[PDB]
């Protein structure tokens, strides 16, 4: 089997991407944030504290003839950005782009943090990291991909995120029309439960490539590119007037700037992030200070190849017995 679904930016900045997901019988379609940095499929629901729901579409398990309470199971997750959610668990039928999994754990939120409430466009998350990170207790549950894998034509999914435009998540096949040149594959460590890999270096604008190993994670659920302070300083030094602002929470730059590109290495291959992908717009409405899309990972504890990086590529998440990651230009 295969599946193919369009993923759409939630706003004009590509702050996140939402993908429609069918849950239950009859189908209830919710728009979920596909997140290769976490491993829980959780949704706003009829169980979510009413004051914490503000415009989201909810899953109502009592209206699904295939929903079953997973007795005694609870979940609770905290994300890198400080947001969180928790609740109980149902199993139900879940379909993405025509690919169906029966008996998928659907984690129903009883509580969500303010950032989730405040984002009316995201109805929940669909985790695509390794199932070892799943938070369900006392019996850990499998991700949608893990459940689908054996049925897929090939044990892979691909992320093809757009810049200020829709893109695609495919399951079970590689669309050879969706990228240019070849896909370069690189090793993955699953030791921390992430799609963790090592970039071979970087360049800023038309500058020379610096060969240096940068360990980080391919994370579709993180907006920005978080890299070591040395790398990030070298980038912003090429933008007149750019500075790190403790009050704002990272590098800012004059909105009048033309940003240089940023290149990262994948083996001997190179992925070029155009400068415009690094612009996240005014820090507040009407400001002439703009927020940068490349930020320091110092004090995160891990480098994160988030959407800013991934949307410059066609990315293969290869879930073979020994997982690997592939990147192509597009």
PDB file of C-alpha atoms in Angstrom:
ATOM      1  CA  UNK A   1       0.000   0.000   0.000  1.00  0.00           C
ATOM      2  CA  UNK A   2       0.858   3.673  -0.214  1.00  0.00           C
ATOM      3  CA  UNK A   3      -0.546   7.004   0.911  1.00  0.00           C
ATOM      4  CA  UNK A   4      -0.108  10.587  -0.318  1.00  0.00           C
ATOM      5  CA  UNK A   5      -1.393  13.725   1.412  1.00  0.00           C
ATOM      6  CA  UNK A   6      -0.912  17.423   0.847  1.00  0.00           C
ATOM      7  CA  UNK A   7       0.570  19.449   3.700  1.00  0.00           C
ATOM      8  CA  UNK A   8      -0.252  23.168   3.917  1.00  0.00           C
ATOM      9  CA  UNK A   9       1.434  26.024   5.822  1.00  0.00           C
ATOM     10  CA  UNK A  10      -0.739  27.347   8.660  1.00  0.00           C
ATOM     11  CA  UNK A  11       0.175  30.974   7.975  1.00  0.00           C
ATOM     12  CA  UNK A  12       2.171  33.285   5.708  1.00  0.00           C
ATOM     13  CA  UNK A  13       5.436  32.521   7.548  1.00  0.00           C
ATOM     14  CA  UNK A  14       5.326  28.717   7.286  1.00  0.00           C
ATOM     15  CA  UNK A  15       5.256  28.533  11.097  1.00  0.00           C
ATOM     16  CA  UNK A  16       3.999  24.943  10.811  1.00  0.00           C
ATOM     17  CA  UNK A  17       2.286  22.672   8.320  1.00  0.00           C
ATOM     18  CA  UNK A  18      -1.031  20.842   8.624  1.00  0.00           C
ATOM     19  CA  UNK A  19      -2.081  17.639   6.907  1.00  0.00           C
ATOM     20  CA  UNK A  20      -5.642  16.273   6.866  1.00  0.00           C
ATOM     21  CA  UNK A  21      -6.103  12.948   8.680  1.00  0.00           C
ATOM     22  CA  UNK A  22      -9.234  10.791   8.755  1.00  0.00           C
ATOM     23  CA  UNK A  23     -10.025   9.298  12.179  1.00  0.00           C
ATOM     24  CA  UNK A  24     -12.859   6.939  12.998  1.00  0.00           C
ATOM     25  CA  UNK A  25     -16.005   5.664  11.343  1.00  0.00           C
ATOM     26  CA  UNK A  26     -17.589   7.625   9.786  1.00  0.00           C
ATOM     27  CA  UNK A  27     -14.426   9.609   9.174  1.00  0.00           C
ATOM     28  CA  UNK A  28     -13.695  12.670  11.271  1.00  0.00           C
ATOM     29  CA  UNK A  29     -11.109  14.768   9.437  1.00  0.00           C
ATOM     30  CA  UNK A  30      -8.664  16.676  11.618  1.00  0.00           C
ATOM     31  CA  UNK A  31      -5.718  18.780  10.459  1.00  0.00           C
ATOM     32  CA  UNK A  32      -2.623  17.469  12.216  1.00  0.00           C
ATOM     33  CA  UNK A  33       0.951  18.691  12.508  1.00  0.00           C
ATOM     34  CA  UNK A  34       3.145  15.843  11.257  1.00  0.00           C
ATOM     35  CA  UNK A  35       6.148  15.846  13.579  1.00  0.00           C
ATOM     36  CA  UNK A  36       9.241  13.726  12.877  1.00  0.00           C
ATOM     37  CA  UNK A  37      10.591  14.870  16.262  1.00  0.00           C
ATOM     38  CA  UNK A  38       7.946  13.166  18.423  1.00  0.00           C
ATOM     39  CA  UNK A  39       6.037   9.891  18.557  1.00  0.00           C
ATOM     40  CA  UNK A  40       2.503  10.561  19.818  1.00  0.00           C
ATOM     41  CA  UNK A  41      -0.617  10.965  17.686  1.00  0.00           C
ATOM     42  CA  UNK A  42      -2.790  13.213  19.834  1.00  0.00           C
ATOM     43  CA  UNK A  43      -5.885  15.228  19.078  1.00  0.00           C
ATOM     44  CA  UNK A  44      -8.169  17.890  20.410  1.00  0.00           C
ATOM     45  CA  UNK A  45     -11.291  16.018  21.411  1.00  0.00           C
ATOM     46  CA  UNK A  46     -14.700  16.049  23.055  1.00  0.00           C
ATOM     47  CA  UNK A  47     -12.727  15.358  26.270  1.00  0.00           C
ATOM     48  CA  UNK A  48     -10.558  18.474  26.043  1.00  0.00           C
ATOM     49  CA  UNK A  49     -11.187  21.023  28.804  1.00  0.00           C
ATOM     50  CA  UNK A  50     -13.688  23.381  27.169  1.00  0.00           C
ATOM     51  CA  UNK A  51     -11.821  26.588  28.037  1.00  0.00           C
ATOM     52  CA  UNK A  52      -8.739  25.199  26.276  1.00  0.00           C
ATOM     53  CA  UNK A  53     -10.505  24.719  22.930  1.00  0.00           C
ATOM     54  CA  UNK A  54     -10.595  27.792  20.672  1.00  0.00           C
ATOM     55  CA  UNK A  55     -11.574  27.013  17.083  1.00  0.00           C
ATOM     56  CA  UNK A  56      -9.964  23.597  16.652  1.00  0.00           C
ATOM     57  CA  UNK A  57     -11.804  20.683  15.126  1.00  0.00           C
ATOM     58  CA  UNK A  58     -12.296  17.958  17.723  1.00  0.00           C
ATOM     59  CA  UNK A  59     -12.357  14.170  17.605  1.00  0.00           C
ATOM     60  CA  UNK A  60     -15.445  12.729  19.302  1.00  0.00           C
ATOM     61  CA  UNK A  61     -14.789   9.041  19.972  1.00  0.00           C
ATOM     62  CA  UNK A  62     -18.402   8.361  21.010  1.00  0.00           C
ATOM     63  CA  UNK A  63     -19.449   9.140  17.408  1.00  0.00           C
ATOM     64  CA  UNK A  64     -16.993   6.612  15.942  1.00  0.00           C
ATOM     65  CA  UNK A  65     -18.235   3.038  15.682  1.00  0.00           C
ATOM     66  CA  UNK A  66     -14.648   1.776  15.514  1.00  0.00           C
ATOM     67  CA  UNK A  67     -13.325   3.698  18.558  1.00  0.00           C
ATOM     68  CA  UNK A  68     -12.383   1.686  21.633  1.00  0.00           C
ATOM     69  CA  UNK A  69     -11.095   3.045  24.932  1.00  0.00           C
ATOM     70  CA  UNK A  70      -7.615   1.707  25.623  1.00  0.00           C
ATOM     71  CA  UNK A  71      -8.360   0.875  29.217  1.00  0.00           C
ATOM     72  CA  UNK A  72      -6.052   2.408  31.797  1.00  0.00           C
ATOM     73  CA  UNK A  73      -3.827   4.140  29.259  1.00  0.00           C
ATOM     74  CA  UNK A  74      -2.780   7.745  29.728  1.00  0.00           C
ATOM     75  CA  UNK A  75      -0.294  10.046  28.037  1.00  0.00           C
ATOM     76  CA  UNK A  76       1.523  13.281  28.804  1.00  0.00           C
ATOM     77  CA  UNK A  77       4.043  15.066  26.630  1.00  0.00           C
ATOM     78  CA  UNK A  78       6.205  18.166  26.861  1.00  0.00           C
ATOM     79  CA  UNK A  79       7.776  19.618  23.725  1.00  0.00           C
ATOM     80  CA  UNK A  80      11.037  21.488  23.224  1.00  0.00           C
ATOM     81  CA  UNK A  81       9.220  24.799  22.894  1.00  0.00           C
ATOM     82  CA  UNK A  82       7.703  24.418  26.364  1.00  0.00           C
ATOM     83  CA  UNK A  83       4.221  23.433  25.204  1.00  0.00           C
ATOM     84  CA  UNK A  84       2.454  20.334  26.536  1.00  0.00           C
ATOM     85  CA  UNK A  85      -0.661  18.196  26.479  1.00  0.00           C
ATOM     86  CA  UNK A  86      -2.048  15.083  28.178  1.00  0.00           C
ATOM     87  CA  UNK A  87      -5.056  12.789  28.322  1.00  0.00           C
ATOM     88  CA  UNK A  88      -6.331   9.268  27.736  1.00  0.00           C
ATOM     89  CA  UNK A  89      -6.231   6.904  24.762  1.00  0.00           C
ATOM     90  CA  UNK A  90      -8.511   5.269  22.218  1.00  0.00           C
ATOM     91  CA  UNK A  91      -7.726   2.931  19.382  1.00  0.00           C
ATOM     92  CA  UNK A  92      -9.435   3.711  16.087  1.00  0.00           C
ATOM     93  CA  UNK A  93      -9.003   3.597  12.330  1.00  0.00           C
ATOM     94  CA  UNK A  94      -6.711   6.316  10.991  1.00  0.00           C
ATOM     95  CA  UNK A  95      -6.141   7.125   7.328  1.00  0.00           C
ATOM     96  CA  UNK A  96      -3.620   9.488   5.734  1.00  0.00           C
ATOM     97  CA  UNK A  97      -3.849  10.180   2.031  1.00  0.00           C
ATOM     98  CA  UNK A  98      -5.540   6.864   1.328  1.00  0.00           C
ATOM     99  CA  UNK A  99      -3.322   4.723   3.611  1.00  0.00           C
ATOM    100  CA  UNK A 100      -5.319   3.129   6.430  1.00  0.00           C
ATOM    101  CA  UNK A 101      -4.166   1.762   9.794  1.00  0.00           C
ATOM    102  CA  UNK A 102      -6.649  -0.058  11.989  1.00  0.00           C
ATOM    103  CA  UNK A 103      -6.129  -0.106  15.749  1.00  0.00           C
ATOM    104  CA  UNK A 104      -4.018   3.074  15.799  1.00  0.00           C
ATOM    105  CA  UNK A 105      -3.566   4.663  19.224  1.00  0.00           C
ATOM    106  CA  UNK A 106      -5.344   8.027  19.111  1.00  0.00           C
ATOM    107  CA  UNK A 107      -4.385  10.022  22.179  1.00  0.00           C
ATOM    108  CA  UNK A 108      -7.288  12.200  23.266  1.00  0.00           C
ATOM    109  CA  UNK A 109      -6.332  15.434  24.988  1.00  0.00           C
ATOM    110  CA  UNK A 110      -7.942  16.285  28.284  1.00  0.00           C
ATOM    111  CA  UNK A 111      -5.541  19.219  28.738  1.00  0.00           C
ATOM    112  CA  UNK A 112      -3.449  21.305  26.352  1.00  0.00           C
ATOM    113  CA  UNK A 113      -1.134  24.241  27.053  1.00  0.00           C
ATOM    114  CA  UNK A 114      -1.910  27.781  25.995  1.00  0.00           C
ATOM    115  CA  UNK A 115       0.148  27.725  22.793  1.00  0.00           C
ATOM    116  CA  UNK A 116      -2.016  24.877  21.464  1.00  0.00           C
ATOM    117  CA  UNK A 117      -5.268  26.595  22.455  1.00  0.00           C
ATOM    118  CA  UNK A 118      -4.094  29.793  20.790  1.00  0.00           C
ATOM    119  CA  UNK A 119      -3.421  28.078  17.484  1.00  0.00           C
ATOM    120  CA  UNK A 120      -6.821  27.415  15.964  1.00  0.00           C
ATOM    121  CA  UNK A 121      -5.336  25.814  12.843  1.00  0.00           C
ATOM    122  CA  UNK A 122      -3.693  22.774  14.486  1.00  0.00           C
ATOM    123  CA  UNK A 123      -6.065  20.040  15.666  1.00  0.00           C
ATOM    124  CA  UNK A 124      -3.289  17.825  17.065  1.00  0.00           C
ATOM    125  CA  UNK A 125       0.029  16.179  16.235  1.00  0.00           C
ATOM    126  CA  UNK A 126       0.972  13.044  14.357  1.00  0.00           C
ATOM    127  CA  UNK A 127       4.364  11.839  15.536  1.00  0.00           C
ATOM    128  CA  UNK A 128       6.775  10.249  13.085  1.00  0.00           C
ATOM    129  CA  UNK A 129       9.891   9.772  15.235  1.00  0.00           C
ATOM    130  CA  UNK A 130      10.682   6.325  16.655  1.00  0.00           C
ATOM    131  CA  UNK A 131       8.058   4.604  18.784  1.00  0.00           C
ATOM    132  CA  UNK A 132      10.508   4.360  21.691  1.00  0.00           C
ATOM    133  CA  UNK A 133       9.597   8.022  22.411  1.00  0.00           C
ATOM    134  CA  UNK A 134       5.849   7.387  22.623  1.00  0.00           C
ATOM    135  CA  UNK A 135       4.529   8.579  26.000  1.00  0.00           C
ATOM    136  CA  UNK A 136       1.555   6.248  26.511  1.00  0.00           C
ATOM    137  CA  UNK A 137       1.619   4.499  29.886  1.00  0.00           C
ATOM    138  CA  UNK A 138       1.600   1.748  31.054  1.00  0.00           C
ATOM    139  CA  UNK A 139       1.774   0.226  27.559  1.00  0.00           C
ATOM    140  CA  UNK A 140       3.782   2.244  25.035  1.00  0.00           C
ATOM    141  CA  UNK A 141       2.108   2.607  21.636  1.00  0.00           C
ATOM    142  CA  UNK A 142       3.331   2.600  18.040  1.00  0.00           C
ATOM    143  CA  UNK A 143       3.373   5.517  15.626  1.00  0.00           C
ATOM    144  CA  UNK A 144       1.197   5.581  12.536  1.00  0.00           C
ATOM    145  CA  UNK A 145       4.267   4.853  10.391  1.00  0.00           C
ATOM    146  CA  UNK A 146       5.395   1.972  12.587  1.00  0.00           C
ATOM    147  CA  UNK A 147       1.913   0.423  12.350  1.00  0.00           C
ATOM    148  CA  UNK A 148       1.724   0.935   8.566  1.00  0.00           C
ATOM    149  CA  UNK A 149       5.271  -0.087   7.730  1.00  0.00           C
ATOM    150  CA  UNK A 150       4.848  -3.787   7.051  1.00  0.00           C
ATOM    151  CA  UNK A 151       1.971  -3.073   4.660  1.00  0.00           C
ATOM    152  CA  UNK A 152       3.782  -0.370   2.691  1.00  0.00           C
ATOM    153  CA  UNK A 153       5.256  -1.087  -0.736  1.00  0.00           C
ATOM    154  CA  UNK A 154       8.564   0.193   0.723  1.00  0.00           C
ATOM    155  CA  UNK A 155       9.156   1.002   4.419  1.00  0.00           C
ATOM    156  CA  UNK A 156       9.616   4.737   3.891  1.00  0.00           C
ATOM    157  CA  UNK A 157       7.907   8.070   4.082  1.00  0.00           C
ATOM    158  CA  UNK A 158       8.941  11.329   2.438  1.00  0.00           C
ATOM    159  CA  UNK A 159       8.576  14.971   3.404  1.00  0.00           C
ATOM    160  CA  UNK A 160       8.381  17.559   0.634  1.00  0.00           C
ATOM    161  CA  UNK A 161       7.567  20.807   2.416  1.00  0.00           C
ATOM    162  CA  UNK A 162       6.858  23.958   0.416  1.00  0.00           C
ATOM    163  CA  UNK A 163       8.172  27.465   0.880  1.00  0.00           C
ATOM    164  CA  UNK A 164       5.088  29.645   1.286  1.00  0.00           C
ATOM    165  CA  UNK A 165       3.199  26.901  -0.582  1.00  0.00           C
ATOM    166  CA  UNK A 166       1.683  23.447  -0.065  1.00  0.00           C
ATOM    167  CA  UNK A 167       3.792  20.307  -0.197  1.00  0.00           C
ATOM    168  CA  UNK A 168       3.413  16.565   0.224  1.00  0.00           C
ATOM    169  CA  UNK A 169       3.871  13.693   2.652  1.00  0.00           C
ATOM    170  CA  UNK A 170       4.086  10.313   0.905  1.00  0.00           C
ATOM    171  CA  UNK A 171       4.064   6.910   2.569  1.00  0.00           C
ATOM    172  CA  UNK A 172       5.438   3.752   0.997  1.00  0.00           C
ATOM    173  CA  UNK A 173       7.041   5.128  -2.168  1.00  0.00           C
ATOM    174  CA  UNK A 174       9.545   7.635  -3.473  1.00  0.00           C
ATOM    175  CA  UNK A 175       8.114  10.014  -6.102  1.00  0.00           C
ATOM    176  CA  UNK A 176      11.007  10.259  -8.529  1.00  0.00           C
ATOM    177  CA  UNK A 177       9.389  13.302 -10.193  1.00  0.00           C
ATOM    178  CA  UNK A 178       9.498  15.347  -6.969  1.00  0.00           C
ATOM    179  CA  UNK A 179      13.231  16.117  -6.844  1.00  0.00           C
ATOM    180  CA  UNK A 180      16.173  16.981  -9.070  1.00  0.00           C
ATOM    181  CA  UNK A 181      19.439  15.069  -9.331  1.00  0.00           C
ATOM    182  CA  UNK A 182      19.980  12.156  -6.963  1.00  0.00           C
ATOM    183  CA  UNK A 183      19.033  11.408  -3.367  1.00  0.00           C
ATOM    184  CA  UNK A 184      22.035  11.236  -1.041  1.00  0.00           C
ATOM    185  CA  UNK A 185      21.520   8.859   1.870  1.00  0.00           C
ATOM    186  CA  UNK A 186      23.199   9.287   5.225  1.00  0.00           C
ATOM    187  CA  UNK A 187      23.379   7.261   8.438  1.00  0.00           C
ATOM    188  CA  UNK A 188      20.861   7.618  11.274  1.00  0.00           C
ATOM    189  CA  UNK A 189      21.253   7.023  14.990  1.00  0.00           C
ATOM    190  CA  UNK A 190      18.035   5.995  16.719  1.00  0.00           C
ATOM    191  CA  UNK A 191      19.660   6.068  20.175  1.00  0.00           C
ATOM    192  CA  UNK A 192      17.685   9.148  21.293  1.00  0.00           C
ATOM    193  CA  UNK A 193      14.531   8.119  19.393  1.00  0.00           C
ATOM    194  CA  UNK A 194      14.999  10.765  16.683  1.00  0.00           C
ATOM    195  CA  UNK A 195      15.957  10.813  13.024  1.00  0.00           C
ATOM    196  CA  UNK A 196      19.437  11.856  14.112  1.00  0.00           C
ATOM    197  CA  UNK A 197      22.176  12.285  11.524  1.00  0.00           C
ATOM    198  CA  UNK A 198      25.447  14.137  10.927  1.00  0.00           C
ATOM    199  CA  UNK A 199      25.751  16.933   8.410  1.00  0.00           C
ATOM    200  CA  UNK A 200      29.165  17.266   6.799  1.00  0.00           C
ATOM    201  CA  UNK A 201      29.384  21.071   7.020  1.00  0.00           C
ATOM    202  CA  UNK A 202      28.045  24.386   5.831  1.00  0.00           C
ATOM    203  CA  UNK A 203      28.557  27.492   3.750  1.00  0.00           C
ATOM    204  CA  UNK A 204      27.165  31.015   4.072  1.00  0.00           C
ATOM    205  CA  UNK A 205      26.069  32.664   0.837  1.00  0.00           C
ATOM    206  CA  UNK A 206      28.698  32.284  -1.866  1.00  0.00           C
ATOM    207  CA  UNK A 207      31.361  31.558   0.745  1.00  0.00           C
ATOM    208  CA  UNK A 208      33.625  28.544   0.938  1.00  0.00           C
ATOM    209  CA  UNK A 209      32.270  25.317   2.391  1.00  0.00           C
ATOM    210  CA  UNK A 210      33.433  24.521   5.922  1.00  0.00           C
ATOM    211  CA  UNK A 211      33.848  20.795   6.453  1.00  0.00           C
ATOM    212  CA  UNK A 212      32.718  20.024   9.979  1.00  0.00           C
ATOM    213  CA  UNK A 213      30.476  17.382  11.533  1.00  0.00           C
ATOM    214  CA  UNK A 214      27.147  18.685  12.821  1.00  0.00           C
ATOM    215  CA  UNK A 215      24.999  16.112  14.605  1.00  0.00           C
ATOM    216  CA  UNK A 216      21.309  16.986  14.614  1.00  0.00           C
ATOM    217  CA  UNK A 217      17.770  15.802  14.046  1.00  0.00           C
ATOM    218  CA  UNK A 218      15.482  16.021  11.025  1.00  0.00           C
ATOM    219  CA  UNK A 219      12.404  17.543  12.665  1.00  0.00           C
ATOM    220  CA  UNK A 220       9.362  18.559  10.634  1.00  0.00           C
ATOM    221  CA  UNK A 221       7.639  19.777  13.815  1.00  0.00           C
ATOM    222  CA  UNK A 222      10.224  22.498  14.498  1.00  0.00           C
ATOM    223  CA  UNK A 223       9.897  25.703  12.469  1.00  0.00           C
ATOM    224  CA  UNK A 224      13.485  26.952  12.447  1.00  0.00           C
ATOM    225  CA  UNK A 225      17.037  25.728  11.890  1.00  0.00           C
ATOM    226  CA  UNK A 226      18.948  25.466  15.198  1.00  0.00           C
ATOM    227  CA  UNK A 227      22.714  25.071  14.869  1.00  0.00           C
ATOM    228  CA  UNK A 228      25.833  25.592  17.001  1.00  0.00           C
ATOM    229  CA  UNK A 229      26.533  29.166  18.063  1.00  0.00           C
ATOM    230  CA  UNK A 230      29.721  29.314  16.002  1.00  0.00           C
ATOM    231  CA  UNK A 231      27.845  28.454  12.784  1.00  0.00           C
ATOM    232  CA  UNK A 232      24.971  30.815  13.539  1.00  0.00           C
ATOM    233  CA  UNK A 233      27.327  33.701  14.341  1.00  0.00           C
ATOM    234  CA  UNK A 234      29.151  33.137  11.035  1.00  0.00           C
ATOM    235  CA  UNK A 235      25.821  33.344   9.186  1.00  0.00           C
ATOM    236  CA  UNK A 236      24.477  36.507  10.823  1.00  0.00           C
ATOM    237  CA  UNK A 237      27.847  38.260  10.570  1.00  0.00           C
ATOM    238  CA  UNK A 238      27.088  38.473   6.832  1.00  0.00           C
ATOM    239  CA  UNK A 239      23.917  40.512   7.438  1.00  0.00           C
ATOM    240  CA  UNK A 240      24.480  44.203   8.175  1.00  0.00           C
ATOM    241  CA  UNK A 241      22.811  45.196  11.415  1.00  0.00           C
ATOM    242  CA  UNK A 242      21.957  41.672  12.557  1.00  0.00           C
ATOM    243  CA  UNK A 243      22.360  40.958  16.248  1.00  0.00           C
ATOM    244  CA  UNK A 244      21.381  38.493  18.924  1.00  0.00           C
ATOM    245  CA  UNK A 245      18.678  39.986  21.100  1.00  0.00           C
ATOM    246  CA  UNK A 246      18.182  38.492  24.552  1.00  0.00           C
ATOM    247  CA  UNK A 247      14.912  40.430  24.894  1.00  0.00           C
ATOM    248  CA  UNK A 248      13.469  39.049  21.653  1.00  0.00           C
ATOM    249  CA  UNK A 249      14.957  35.568  22.130  1.00  0.00           C
ATOM    250  CA  UNK A 250      17.391  35.195  19.257  1.00  0.00           C
ATOM    251  CA  UNK A 251      18.939  36.759  16.197  1.00  0.00           C
ATOM    252  CA  UNK A 252      17.076  39.633  14.599  1.00  0.00           C
ATOM    253  CA  UNK A 253      17.969  41.586  11.490  1.00  0.00           C
ATOM    254  CA  UNK A 254      16.817  44.729   9.678  1.00  0.00           C
ATOM    255  CA  UNK A 255      13.764  43.984   7.605  1.00  0.00           C
ATOM    256  CA  UNK A 256      15.459  45.970   4.797  1.00  0.00           C
ATOM    257  CA  UNK A 257      18.189  43.316   4.480  1.00  0.00           C
ATOM    258  CA  UNK A 258      18.726  40.887   1.653  1.00  0.00           C
ATOM    259  CA  UNK A 259      19.603  37.595   3.398  1.00  0.00           C
ATOM    260  CA  UNK A 260      22.345  35.290   2.109  1.00  0.00           C
ATOM    261  CA  UNK A 261      21.639  31.633   1.445  1.00  0.00           C
ATOM    262  CA  UNK A 262      22.812  28.891   3.788  1.00  0.00           C
ATOM    263  CA  UNK A 263      24.174  25.578   2.515  1.00  0.00           C
ATOM    264  CA  UNK A 264      24.380  22.368   4.540  1.00  0.00           C
ATOM    265  CA  UNK A 265      26.228  19.181   3.640  1.00  0.00           C
ATOM    266  CA  UNK A 266      24.734  15.720   3.274  1.00  0.00           C
ATOM    267  CA  UNK A 267      27.721  13.505   2.617  1.00  0.00           C
ATOM    268  CA  UNK A 268      29.387  14.988  -0.467  1.00  0.00           C
ATOM    269  CA  UNK A 269      26.097  16.607  -1.525  1.00  0.00           C
ATOM    270  CA  UNK A 270      24.880  20.103  -0.707  1.00  0.00           C
ATOM    271  CA  UNK A 271      21.429  21.499   0.068  1.00  0.00           C
ATOM    272  CA  UNK A 272      21.012  25.236  -0.452  1.00  0.00           C
ATOM    273  CA  UNK A 273      18.521  27.147   1.681  1.00  0.00           C
ATOM    274  CA  UNK A 274      17.661  30.405  -0.145  1.00  0.00           C
ATOM    275  CA  UNK A 275      17.994  33.570   1.909  1.00  0.00           C
ATOM    276  CA  UNK A 276      14.277  34.305   1.765  1.00  0.00           C
ATOM    277  CA  UNK A 277      13.566  31.020   3.620  1.00  0.00           C
ATOM    278  CA  UNK A 278      15.436  32.492   6.607  1.00  0.00           C
ATOM    279  CA  UNK A 279      13.118  35.532   6.950  1.00  0.00           C
ATOM    280  CA  UNK A 280      10.434  35.139   9.646  1.00  0.00           C
ATOM    281  CA  UNK A 281       9.197  38.688   9.400  1.00  0.00           C
ATOM    282  CA  UNK A 282       8.673  41.509  11.865  1.00  0.00           C
ATOM    283  CA  UNK A 283       9.184  40.635  15.530  1.00  0.00           C
ATOM    284  CA  UNK A 284       5.896  42.427  16.246  1.00  0.00           C
ATOM    285  CA  UNK A 285       3.373  43.957  13.896  1.00  0.00           C
ATOM    286  CA  UNK A 286       4.788  47.039  12.195  1.00  0.00           C
ATOM    287  CA  UNK A 287       8.344  46.559  13.446  1.00  0.00           C
ATOM    288  CA  UNK A 288      11.317  47.003  11.142  1.00  0.00           C
ATOM    289  CA  UNK A 289      13.233  44.348  13.093  1.00  0.00           C
ATOM    290  CA  UNK A 290      12.768  40.890  11.620  1.00  0.00           C
ATOM    291  CA  UNK A 291      13.218  37.485  13.248  1.00  0.00           C
ATOM    292  CA  UNK A 292      15.847  35.149  11.845  1.00  0.00           C
ATOM    293  CA  UNK A 293      15.213  31.597  10.711  1.00  0.00           C
ATOM    294  CA  UNK A 294      18.636  30.304  11.755  1.00  0.00           C
ATOM    295  CA  UNK A 295      19.108  30.373  15.536  1.00  0.00           C
ATOM    296  CA  UNK A 296      21.542  28.972  18.077  1.00  0.00           C
ATOM    297  CA  UNK A 297      20.964  25.523  19.533  1.00  0.00           C
ATOM    298  CA  UNK A 298      23.062  26.405  22.586  1.00  0.00           C
ATOM    299  CA  UNK A 299      21.080  25.338  25.619  1.00  0.00           C
ATOM    300  CA  UNK A 300      18.655  23.198  23.586  1.00  0.00           C
ATOM    301  CA  UNK A 301      21.156  20.385  23.872  1.00  0.00           C
ATOM    302  CA  UNK A 302      20.673  19.259  20.268  1.00  0.00           C
ATOM    303  CA  UNK A 303      20.909  20.724  16.781  1.00  0.00           C
ATOM    304  CA  UNK A 304      17.617  20.746  14.906  1.00  0.00           C
ATOM    305  CA  UNK A 305      17.177  20.650  11.138  1.00  0.00           C
ATOM    306  CA  UNK A 306      13.661  22.043  11.274  1.00  0.00           C
ATOM    307  CA  UNK A 307      11.379  23.248   8.504  1.00  0.00           C
ATOM    308  CA  UNK A 308      13.715  26.047   7.322  1.00  0.00           C
ATOM    309  CA  UNK A 309      16.215  23.357   6.310  1.00  0.00           C
ATOM    310  CA  UNK A 310      13.871  20.547   5.346  1.00  0.00           C
ATOM    311  CA  UNK A 311      11.697  22.631   3.014  1.00  0.00           C
ATOM    312  CA  UNK A 312      14.794  23.236   0.843  1.00  0.00           C
ATOM    313  CA  UNK A 313      14.942  19.479   0.159  1.00  0.00           C
ATOM    314  CA  UNK A 314      13.049  16.341  -0.730  1.00  0.00           C
ATOM    315  CA  UNK A 315      13.619  14.216   2.386  1.00  0.00           C
ATOM    316  CA  UNK A 316      13.374  10.433   2.645  1.00  0.00           C
ATOM    317  CA  UNK A 317      12.761   8.898   6.056  1.00  0.00           C
ATOM    318  CA  UNK A 318      13.867   5.319   5.402  1.00  0.00           C
ATOM    319  CA  UNK A 319      12.462   2.965   8.028  1.00  0.00           C
ATOM    320  CA  UNK A 320      14.285  -0.133   6.842  1.00  0.00           C
ATOM    321  CA  UNK A 321      15.782  -2.448   9.460  1.00  0.00           C
ATOM    322  CA  UNK A 322      18.709  -0.033   9.641  1.00  0.00           C
ATOM    323  CA  UNK A 323      17.074   3.377   9.173  1.00  0.00           C
ATOM    324  CA  UNK A 324      18.685   6.063   7.015  1.00  0.00           C
ATOM    325  CA  UNK A 325      17.806   9.571   5.799  1.00  0.00           C
ATOM    326  CA  UNK A 326      17.936  10.764   2.210  1.00  0.00           C
ATOM    327  CA  UNK A 327      18.133  14.329   0.912  1.00  0.00           C
ATOM    328  CA  UNK A 328      17.723  15.634  -2.633  1.00  0.00           C
ATOM    329  CA  UNK A 329      17.534  19.113  -4.067  1.00  0.00           C
ATOM    330  CA  UNK A 330      14.251  20.032  -5.748  1.00  0.00           C
TER     331      UNK A 330
END
